[PDB]
Amino acid sequence: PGVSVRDVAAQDFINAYASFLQRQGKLEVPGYVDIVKTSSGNEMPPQDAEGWFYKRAASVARHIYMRKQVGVGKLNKLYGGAKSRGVRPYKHIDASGSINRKVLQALEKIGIVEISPKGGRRISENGQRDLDRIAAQTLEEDE
Amino acid sequence: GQPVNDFIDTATRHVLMRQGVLGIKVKIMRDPAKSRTGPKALPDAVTIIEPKEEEPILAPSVKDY
Amino acid sequence: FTPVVLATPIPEEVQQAQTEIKLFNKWSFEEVEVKDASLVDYVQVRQPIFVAHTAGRYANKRFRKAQCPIIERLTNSLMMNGRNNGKKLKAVRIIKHTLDIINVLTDQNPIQVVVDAITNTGPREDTTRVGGGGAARRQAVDVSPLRRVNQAIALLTIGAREAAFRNIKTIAETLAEELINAAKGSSTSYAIKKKDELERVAKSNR
């Protein structure tokens, strides 16, 4: 009786949407997905190599639903972290804009996000629809 | 205090003589009673106006109109 | 039981338990008594608390720490050393895990275990300093009950810290086994070892 991604938990929903995007597979990932560190503030590549890009896609799709319009700068600021500069103190350094834009335009070529005026990217019709249906199946996953 | 920032005017002047320069510090505290704007007194004076007295018994009566 | 179902879930487990009795997470706050005298009115186990994180002002006046419930004091003493000065949400998880381990090791009430541990490791007789020209002496002096409770909690947490600095065992396990042995003093707790050395040095220096 009324379902939303706000009404479903975050981690669970993100795992289930990552598993759905794994089961579909139409994401056309770039060739350098194993190379990258996802930020210059990292030092090791992501551990779960087979699904880190799809988890990033799930998180970005949820973010676009939650907000009005954001860009690659906002995504890099969010997915950045603390850079270990050695003996010097930590700083906040932005994430990898290349993989952020690759996952953004991959969600575009699926049809989940599109170009929003005054700049930006906003959630689509079928994108809001399929995020809401998988929010449903995560709500009624109870036995 | 802010009373010094309100009422006191200070001036500094360098005077050149045949020896080294002389420093004149002039400080003038204005009276409060002849001020035209702002407070008229220092924030310490509690000036109390005197009352007037009336006879108590008064022969209690009424007036007709 | 009369549950009221809304479109917001409000699950039945928290519904039933915390409508019936004002608990911990799921732990009864009644039927706990301080087994010994001289620590009542200070070991605050008469007013219940959901979660030890409270924004209560206790350091303003003189004995509001005595008015404070004891589990928050356990978290606040789990808090020390400069790596972890600030992370009392983390300290609350450690404490929840510790009391879970207490329940697994022994079926009795974990708050009763904490009370018994504090009671059995409060150092009854300390030793103070006297000028004493020459060897600069020490004289045995008894301990006020709030200082008993404070030194008890400090001994427990320092023992857990140093026994789980570089080990496989985690802070929750080390604190739980120290609390178990302090509840049953078996000459194995660092807290009761420091208590015993304090008592023997006091009875020597008196």
Partner: protein, 141 residues
């Protein structure tokens, strides 16, 4: 129509604006259920008001909280106030004084002040030290 009241809850920098209206009985923060806020162990801290007084007294109220400023603990301790003051304000404005009063007795019997906010504010930092009271280490030698 829409018999609603607006209340607030503050901690150090968090402002939580609670809209409290007569409805079906739902309780939501930032468009999401209370059962989904993420301070992890402070899920019970939010429930504290709802629980203490009793779910019954909320079985006819819709409250929606919009939250700004301050870190996560500041966020949660503010919801607590709003879903308790909005409660106290609603029972003031619409129902019996004995009911509002006995809610006040329960709240002040158990309180982490709840209805009143904390007057503790971050004092300003002074020169000669990285902290507000602590000063730089001097050497003498």
């Amino acid at each position: 129509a829409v018999p609603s009241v607006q209340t607030f809850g503050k901690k150090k920098s968090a402002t939580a604006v609670a809209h409290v209206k007569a409805g079906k009985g739902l309780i939501k923060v930032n468009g999401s259920p209370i059962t989904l806020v993420e301070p992890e162990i402070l899920r019970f801290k939010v429930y504290e008001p709802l629980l203490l007084v009793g779910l019954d007294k909320f079985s006819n109220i819709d409250i929606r909280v919009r939250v700004t400023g301050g870190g996560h603990v500041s966020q949660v301790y503010a919801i607590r106030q709003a879903i308790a003051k909005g409660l106290v304000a609603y029972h003031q404005k619409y129902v019996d004084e004995q009911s509002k009063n006995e809610l006040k007795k329960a709240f002040t019997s158990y309180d982490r002040t709840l209805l009143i906010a904390d007057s503790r504010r971050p004092e300003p930092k002074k020169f000669g030290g990285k902290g507000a009271r602590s000063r730089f280490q001097k050497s003498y030698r």
